[PDB]
Amino acid sequence: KLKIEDFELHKMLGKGSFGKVFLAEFKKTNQFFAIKALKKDVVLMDDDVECTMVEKRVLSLAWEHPFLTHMFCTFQTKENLFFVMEYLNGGDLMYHIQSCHKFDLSRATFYAAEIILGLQFLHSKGIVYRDLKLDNILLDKDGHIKIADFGMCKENMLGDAKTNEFCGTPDYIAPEILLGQKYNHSVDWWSFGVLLYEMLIGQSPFHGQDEEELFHSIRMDNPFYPRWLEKEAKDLLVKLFVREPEKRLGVRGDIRQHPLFREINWEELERKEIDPPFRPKVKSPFDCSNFDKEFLNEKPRLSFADRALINSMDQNMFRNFSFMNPGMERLISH
Amino acid sequence: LKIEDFELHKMLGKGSFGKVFLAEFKKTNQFFAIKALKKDVVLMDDDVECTMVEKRVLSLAWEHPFLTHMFCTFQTKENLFFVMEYLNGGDLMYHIQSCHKFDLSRATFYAAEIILGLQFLHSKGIVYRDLKLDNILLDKDGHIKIADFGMCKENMLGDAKTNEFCGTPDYIAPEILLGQKYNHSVDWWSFGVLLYEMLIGQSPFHGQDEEELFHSIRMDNPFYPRWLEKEAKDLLVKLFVREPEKRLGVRGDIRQHPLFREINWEELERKEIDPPFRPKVKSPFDPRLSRALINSMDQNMFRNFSFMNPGM
Ligand SMILES: C[C@@H]1C(=O)NN=C2COc3cc(-c4ccccc4)c(N(C)C4(C)CN(C)C4)cc3N21
Ligand SMILES: C[C@@H]1C(=O)NN=C2COc3cc(-c4ccccc4)c(N(C)C4(C)CN(C)C4)cc3N21
Ligand code: NA
């Protein structure tokens, strides 16, 4: 017995076709959370039932690593699916990059390095992420990265294992996906290269007025590296933008030992003992300063649902959705 | 793909044509809209070609976002089935009746998306010919979806024209009423009437019967309230020009009209502009399917009706 009525929803942090994200407090205990609220009819019509389940299962693994969004619990009603998360109020990287256009080399290097620790952890558990992009990297109050939105993940990718779904955000989609090849963790490293390029250069590496032109650019065009770019930043990007997956850095070699990361102790980084070069402005743990005001002004509200589609729905589609860590269990029982 | 695979959960609509069904496919647990047409009624009305034209135009529809995406078609010895994506936002007649008239932003957004939808059909050589509020559906996000392509005419490319008297009375073009040959122009008069109704909350031309209504469409000038935006009038006045060659949509560039000044068309066409209105009501709608004529019918009349777009 855990319902959304138990949570007081203070503000709406984000919104989309998927659903909404709220800044939520539990039972007036000054204990804050972020709640991604989905509607089951939306999820059904979008064909994201398995994605929702993949999101829940991956987040059950994500507790063990510092640079993934941590999930306290999940639960469902007849209409709704709720992911009760930690509240990460640093702001995402897309938001931050809209303001300054470009990240300085130390700042980009730091983010790149923390993301590597995130991705390699997922790969080691047999999870390929497939939706790496700026707005899926959330910052915490101190400025370290947290990878978010695992609904596009693929599990059981250990050993000699491949998969075949055309997916990802267009700018980031790897050429092996575009070519219809079966793929492994390699895709994430091409996307990583795209993300790193955007951090450093402030524009995308590949371009087009439509997807056909954009996908062609990803298949064929040489990425532009400005004269001002640090030689090792160029080098890493080049070694990531290799179209043959099994020759790509991150699939082969050791990406940790690339000269760009010379000054990084990876044990220290992983232990959060390296102060981030950028620290976001955060007056409090309940601060909202780093979110867009279109969402924050719009008061929190749960949408109605297609009552016909829900009653007609296969009632056990979201079986095994409810998860509950022991920490949240103590908080609730008081 | 037989009808027995689908489970018909709820009826979404009824008419003289037949029924629309909220259908779930068997093993996939995946939901659709099925338009079921009785063959006996189709042959009675002599709208056999229309049904075939609907399938062929729907087979083109999947490429464009603001048209209703058909997944597959098949037939039985009694019925004809179109398997369609399920759109539960409600049609624009339900919405105009809910709140009398749409605001400037909301009307412009619907006007713009319909332009892209019609222009897509026109380049394919297809004139729609039955544009009206109750044929425009909305998806769950609130983007428009043009439905009911039964009244289309194909192969209308370049110089070509056609001569059929058809449409919905309020929306029929004046050249059609004068018994003239016509091209895609006729859709742009109907677009004007639709746009008018959205902004003002009623029809531009009026009559107690059909004769009086057709007269009004031919003769009377549409009334423009003093409160109406200058650029909304300017467009409607440019759309309501009875000589098709000088009409906007046919002549000039409709997209560069100052009413669409704030719109990014390539961005709009890729669903990257959020609609100003989202449906608050989810599925604003109201189960089983209901011999001499069928046996004595030419069995091969509804041939080559079956189809499946690779997306299925
Ligand atoms: C749920 C997650 C979390 O685990 N902790 N804290 C937060 C803070 O609020 C979020 C907002 C969004 C968001 C932002 C803008 C639009 C849509 C969603 C958001 N989402 C879904 C994104 C990852 C999508 N990207 C734009 C940001 C996430 C959060 N989170
Ligand atoms: C099949 C179609 C689709 O492509 N997607 N989703 C739907 C949802 O349900 C529909 C209902 C009707 C309808 C509505 C009222 C009366 C009669 C039919 C309906 N029809 C026949 C209209 C085009 C007629 N107009 C009132 C709406 C269509 C749908 N569709
Ligand atoms: Na190019």
Swiss-Prot record, chain B:
Outcome (variant: K35 to A/E): Loss of kinase activity
Phosphothreonine modified-residue sites: E164
Active-site feature positions: D130
Chain residues that bind ATP: L12, G13, K14, G15, S16, F17, G18, K19, V20, K35
Domain of life: Eukaryota
Ranges for domain AGC-kinase C-terminal: 261-312
Record annotation: effect of changing S306A: Reduction in kinase activity
Disulfides per UniProt: none
Cell location: Cytoplasm; Cell membrane
Record-annotated Protein kinase domain positions: 6-260
Positions of modified residues (Phosphoserine): S290, S296, S306
Subunit organization: Part of a lipid raft complex composed at least of BCL10, CARD11, MALT1 and IKBKB. Interacts with GLRX3 (via N-terminus). Interacts with ECT2. Interacts with CCDC88A/GIV; the interaction leads to phosphorylation of CCDC88A and inhibition of its guanine nucleotide exchange factor activity. Interacts with PRKCH upstream open reading frame 2; the interaction leads to inhibition of kinase activity. Interacts with CD28.
Family: Belongs to the protein kinase superfamily. AGC Ser/Thr protein kinase family. PKC subfamily.
Comment text on domains: The C1 domain, containing the phorbol ester/DAG-type region 1 (C1A) and 2 (C1B), is the diacylglycerol sensor and the C2 domain is a non-calcium binding domain.
Role according to the record: Calcium-independent, phospholipid- and diacylglycerol (DAG)-dependent serine/threonine-protein kinase that mediates non-redundant functions in T-cell receptor (TCR) signaling, including T-cells activation, proliferation, differentiation and survival, by mediating activation of multiple transcription factors such as NF-kappa-B, JUN, NFATC1 and NFATC2. In TCR-CD3/CD28-co-stimulated T-cells, is required for the activation of NF-kappa-B and JUN, which in turn are essential for IL2 production, and participates in the calcium-dependent NFATC1 and NFATC2 transactivation.
Protein name: Protein kinase C theta type
Organism: Homo sapiens (Human)
Protein encoded by which gene: PRKCQ
